[PDB]
A paper describes a structure:
Purification of SIFI through its subunit KCMF1 led to a complementary map of the N-terminal half of UBR4 at an overall resolution of 3.4 Å. SIFI’s scaffold is primarily composed of α-helical armadillo repeats of UBR4 and relies on antiparallel dimer interfaces at its N- and C-terminal regions with buried surface areas of around 2,160 Å2 and 4,212 Å2, respectively. The N-terminal dimer interface is mediated by a domain-swapped helix from one protomer that bundles with three helices of the second, as well as two Arg residues that interlock the dimer through polar interactions.
Residue numbers in the entry:
A (entry chain B): 28 to 161, 182 to 205, 228 to 354, 366 to 433, 441 to 451, 465 to 499, 504 to 546
B (entry chain A): 274 to 354, 366 to 433, 440 to 451, 465 to 499, 503 to 554, 640 to 890, 903 to 1092
The structure:
């Protein structure tokens, strides 16, 4: 009987999914639920490919599913999301699906559409063609959709827009299944346990101790090594961004809020370090491919910063001073990165052959600064504008130690700005950036 | 401020005279309110620092308290009862007051200095104030009013413990209160399960409290469930009143309907669907038989409304949504379930006649409850649910009684198709013991109804007709349950009633067509001529009766040899109705003619699928008796059958099963066969006679 299932699958693989065969696969999954959840690695590939293809096809027909059959679709999708989160929590070698692809499958079950590419879809079909598996039927099917309608009612609250609305329900109840599995949390665990993200988070956390900002991709050799580590880092940043687009960080509670800030400041630092490495590359010295990779990395770095910022801002469990302090920390990181990229010369790099803003400060502009440098800089300017507007009103009609590098850290406006001023001669950094930009534009 | 202490909510215009004085001061109050609102509207309080945040919050609540006070004073005036001018001032005050609250609120929420937990506590304070005021206003009775004839202590009413005083202003406050309630409950939900106890949250924006504590505070301050239901009932009833007025303060029933619908949605989602244990526990405890009765009343009111309208439809759907939630939710105790069923009149263990016709939600709810009960038993392999077996036996009897009386019922007094469908579904879930007992009871009922032929011959048969549709469907399907019936029930009873003007009955082709003609032209308001065995394919007469049904018929429980007679004799039912109504210069109405056509059709199919019994084969083997009108009809039918061997076989094998000696069978069949001209001459002589 496993045969007929791969069957509707391939029939639909050819020319879209036959809604008619759909009520068959839903049944299949809802049943083999326990099998998919607990199976032997002998048929891991089979089960994994089954789940991926099922998710993709159910998302393809998300907008068009019989309103009566809609509930069974939601049950089968809860089973599929269970398998996906289980795998993302416990990475398995016998699994035939990549963590990026699994995160993307959860994203699609929980979002408007699936994104698994067709090349990868045919790869899944081949891993399924592996066949490495371990009337009356109509009656059973309807009786089951029955035990479903009965037991639980859709509470379907919240003909060219009815598709919109069905997608809406699909999405919503799938999101609910996730929250149901606390996958959002499981998924924060996953985001904090990425292979390249572990080290980036370690360095950024070492830095919240006011140990100067200390980007590491800096020695000629270290920048060569990170250009080597550029492509794989893109893979991790992309995966993290795809994951944190879902309601992964919905309940921003101090506890979780800390980790949410951690991951955000983590890509911030990873991106600033990649920018510093590109700065060393242009100052000290497939290359175009690596350049595009690093550009994408810095872009998604700023994007994740912005996402976590807006999350803390519109949250009912976080925001105000908490959001203000997240902004403060982001601005600190960006300004320190700008300073490091500005003050690096062929001379210094060659002599080195772990920059410290305080090191350069005690020792005491052009070059290194580039297009990625423009990006970090514009963002820093936004954040500084915000903090300074705060300081205005605060001193309404003209109206402590530097703000600690922590999200919940309590500080006055003047204080956040004093920490941002004690980390870099600010007037200097700003004017230097102005001059350099003007010159380069000329 | 005094109220914030110990949530001692109070209002000073409790006395009508007090309210009158308050009204007198309405004008300047309006000016103050407008002025304050405008001042807040213009760029002000940019930094909501704790101190400023508190000050801003105070003003928000200041207007808030004033607005509810005005609403209360008006309610007091009404119960006691420039007039419009004062009403205008009061309405303006309430509206602008709520607007001040909302401004200060968006400010807190969006601000960068205190925008989140402070917003949440501001919302608690607001709800608390709104809920307290609403509760107080509803609790204001002219009696208590004159008794007083000043602080309206909510605690006193509760501690001490019509519902008049609810009006447009009450609706406004209720709506805003609902909004605040929804938010705090959504907050509860986002939190994972059972995060935690603790004390009622404190009435302070700065005070940091758990969402549960905030909700706990609201519940402790005022009974959330009671207030919600009170508002719901009052709103719906008031809307109905306005509707009646229109058939014969805002007179828009939709307004109250909207509020009522919102209340249903809030409870169902924020509470009923809430997985929070605390919430569920509170709900279960809050739930009372009184609430069930109120809910039942509203259901019946909606079901018996007879007017879909527009907003009414939305409210109706929401009502069902709430009803089904209750039926599925374990919060509703079995005691509460039975209470609601009795209040609807569909109690599955009540006495008297079974309600043949059941109202659209009264039926849907009953079906959901009974089916969930049968599933519970089936899940653990428990014995047939006694409740559903009693529905079945009280139905079979309202019916033996109805057919014994042979009185044509009205559409409101006739079994609805969807009801028949859910009953067949329940019959299936029953074990062999239950379904066999139902079959035996049906046989006994038909046999007893045949005891008086004269009465049956002069009665209209719509009800022996429905009993035999039932028995017929039982015959064809007595083991496996059909796919259509499932779909049928799910689509009709177990699915949102929005506002699909169709059930889903396999109607009779011949009967329904004739009805339509001699019937309302707009649409067929009701299926009175339908079928529940599907427009099936014409299988060979043989093998129609479900093998297991055949086995039961020939078991000791069923005396088929004699049910054959009661069935043959029954054909004369409603034969002299035309002879009677014409003698009395009356014409068989369309319903009556249609019914008579329906009955012959149903009994004709039954006589055909049921195997000829031994006594009757023996008769076909003598022919001396009268073989009356219908008797000869049946005889010719079976002779034609016997001419064909398949039927010979079918009938002879049934005789072997019947228990008749096999050789006896052979001989009888032979004689009846009258092979060759023998049969020709036999036909001839029977028609000759």
């Amino acid at each position: 009987g496993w045969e007929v299932a791969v069957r509707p699958l391939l029939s639909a693989s050819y020319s879209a999914f036959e809604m008619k065969e759909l009520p068959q696969l839903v049944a299949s999954v809802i049943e083999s639920e326990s099998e998919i959840l607990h199976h032997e690695k002998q048929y891991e590939p089979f089960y994994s490919s089954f789940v991926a293809l099922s998710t993709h096809y159910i998302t393809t027909v998300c907008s068009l599913i019989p309103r009566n059959q809609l509930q069974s679709v939601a049950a089968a999708c809860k089973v599929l999301i269970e398998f996906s989160l289980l795998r993302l929590e416990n990475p398995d070698e016998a699994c035939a699906v990549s963590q990026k692809h699994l995160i993307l499958l959860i994203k699609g079950l929980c979002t408007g559409c699936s994104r698994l590419d067709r090349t990868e879809i045919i790869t899944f079909t081949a891993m399924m063609k592996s066949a490495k598996l371990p009337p009356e039927l109509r009656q059973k099917e309807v009786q089951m959709n029955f035990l479903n309608q009965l037991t639980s009612v859709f509470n379907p609250r919240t003909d060219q827009a009815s598709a919109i609305k069905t997608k809406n329900v699909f999405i919503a109840q799938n999101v609910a299944s996730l929250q149901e599995l606390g996958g959002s949390e499981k998924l924060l665990r996953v985001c904090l346990n990425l292979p390249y993200f572990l080290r980036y988070i370690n360095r950024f956390q070492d830095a919240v101790l006011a140990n100067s900002f200390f980007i590491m991709p800096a020695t000629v050799a270290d920048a060569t090594a990170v250009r080597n580590g550029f492509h794989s880092l893109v893979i991790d940043v992309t995966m993290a961004l795809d994951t944190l687009s879902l309601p992964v960080l919905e309940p921003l509670n101090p506890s979780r809020l800390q980790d949410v800030t951690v991951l955000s400041l983590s890509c911030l630092y990873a991106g600033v370090s990649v920018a510093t490495c590109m700065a060393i590359l242009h100052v000290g010295s497939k290359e175009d491919d690596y350049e595009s990779d690093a550009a994408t990395i810095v872009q998604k770095c700023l994007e994740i910063y912005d996402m976590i910022g807006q999350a803390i801002s519109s949250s009912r469990r976080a925001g105000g001073e908490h959001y203000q302090n997240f902004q403060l920390l982001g601005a600190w990181c960006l300004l320190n990165s700008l300073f490091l990229i500005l003050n690096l010369s062929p001379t210094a790099l060659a002599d080195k052959g772990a920059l410290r803003v305080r090191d350069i400060l005690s020792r005491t502009g052009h070059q290194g600064f580039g297009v990625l440098s423009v990006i970090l800089a514009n963002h820093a300017i936004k954040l500084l504008t915000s903090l300074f507007q705060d300081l205005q009103v605060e001193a309404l009609h003209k109206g402590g130690p530097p703000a600690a590098l922590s999200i919940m850290a309590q500080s006055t406006s003047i204080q956040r700005i004093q920490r941002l001023i004690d980390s870099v001669p600010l007037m200097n950094l700003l004017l230097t950036l102005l001059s350099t930009s003007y010159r380069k534009a000329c | 401020q005094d109220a914030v202490l110990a949530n001692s909510f109070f209002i000073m215009p409790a006395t009508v005279a007090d309210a009158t004085a308050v009204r007198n001061g309405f004008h300047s109050l309006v000016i103050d309110v407008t002025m304050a609102l405008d001042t807040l509207s213009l760029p002000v309080l940019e930094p909501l620092n704790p101190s400023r945040l508190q000050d801003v919050t105070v003003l928000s609540l200041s207007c808030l308290y004033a607005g509810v006070s005005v609403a209360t004073c008006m309610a007091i005036l009404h119960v006691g009862s420039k007039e419009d001018d004062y009403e205008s001032d009061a309405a303006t005050i309430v509206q602008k007051c709520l607007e001040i609250y909302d401004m200060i609120g968006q400010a807190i929420s969006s601000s960068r200095r205190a925008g989140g937990e402070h917003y949440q506590n501001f919302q608690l304070l607001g709800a608390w104030c709104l809920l307290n005021s609403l509760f107080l206003i509803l609790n204001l009775s002219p009696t208590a009013l004159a008794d007083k004839g000043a602080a309206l202590r909510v605690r006193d009413i509760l501690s001490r413990t019509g519902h008049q005083g609810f009006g447009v202003l009450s609706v406004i406050l209720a709506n805003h209160a609902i909004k605040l309630l929804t938010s705090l409950f959504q907050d509860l939900q986002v939190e994972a399960l059972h995060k935690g106890d603790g004390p009622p949250a404190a009435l302070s924006i700065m005070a940091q409290s758990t969402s549960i504590q905030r909700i706990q505070r609201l519940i402790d301050s005022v009974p959330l469930m009671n207030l919600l239901l009170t508002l719901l009932s009052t709103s719906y009833r008031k809307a109905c009143v306005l509707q009646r007025q229109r058939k014969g303060s805002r007179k828009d029933p939709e307004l109250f309907l909207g509020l009522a619908s919102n209340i249903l949605n809030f409870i169902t989602s924020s509470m009923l669907n809430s997985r929070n244990n605390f919430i569920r526990n509170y709900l279960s405890v809050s739930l009372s038989e009184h609430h069930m009765a109120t809910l039942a009343s509203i259901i019946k009111e909606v079901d018996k409304d007879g007017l879909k309208g527009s907003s009414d439809e939305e409210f109706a759907a929401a009502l069902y949504h709430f009803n089904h939630s209750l039926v599925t939710s374990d919060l509703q105790s079995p005691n509460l379930q039975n209470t609601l069923l009795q209040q609807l009149g569909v109690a599955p263990f009540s006495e008297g006649p079974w309600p043949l016709y059941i109202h659209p939600q009264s039926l849907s709810v009953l079906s959901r409850l009974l089916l969930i009960w049968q599933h519970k038993a089936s899940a653990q392999g428990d014995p047939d649910v006694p409740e559903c077996l009693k529905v079945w036996d009280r139905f079979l009897s309202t019916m033996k009684q109805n057919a014994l009386q042979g009185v044509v019922p009205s559409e409101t007094e006739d079994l609805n198709v969807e009801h028949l469908q859910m009953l067949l579904l329940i019959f299936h879930n029953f074990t062999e013991t239950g379904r066999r007992a139902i079959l035996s009871l049906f046989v006994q009922i038909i046999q007893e109804l045949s005891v008086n032929m004269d009465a049956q011959m002069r009665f209209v048969p719509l009800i022996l007709a429905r009993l035999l549709l039932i028995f017929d469907y039982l015959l064809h399907q007595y083991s496996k349950a059909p796919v259509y019936l499932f779909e049928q029930v799910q689509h009709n009873l177990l699915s949102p009633p929005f506002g699909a003007t169709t059930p889903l009955y396999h109607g009779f082709k011949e009967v329904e067509e004739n009805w339509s003609k001699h019937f309302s032209s707009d649409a067929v308001p009701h299926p009175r001529f339908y079928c529940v065995l599907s427009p099936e394919a014409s299988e060979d007469d043989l093998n129609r009766l479900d093998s297991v049904a055949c086995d039961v018929l020939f078991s000791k429980l069923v005396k088929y040899d004699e049910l054959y007679a009661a069935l043959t004799a029954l054909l004369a039912a409603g034969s002299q109705l035309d002879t009677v109504r014409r003698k009395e210069n009356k014409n068989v109405t369309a319903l009556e003619a249609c019914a008579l056509q329906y009955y012959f059709l149903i009994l004709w199919r039954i006589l055909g699928i049921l195997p000829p019994s031994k006594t009757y084969i023996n008769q076909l083997s003598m022919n001396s008796p009268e073989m009356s009108e219908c008797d000869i009809l049946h005889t010719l039918r079976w002779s034609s059958r016997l001419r064909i061997s398949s039927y010979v076989n079918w009938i002879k094998d049934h005789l072997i099963k019947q228990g008749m000696k096999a050789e006896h069978a052979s001989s009888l069949l032979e004689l009846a066969s009258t092979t060759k001209c023998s049969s020709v001459k036999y036909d001839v002589e029977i028609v000759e006679e």
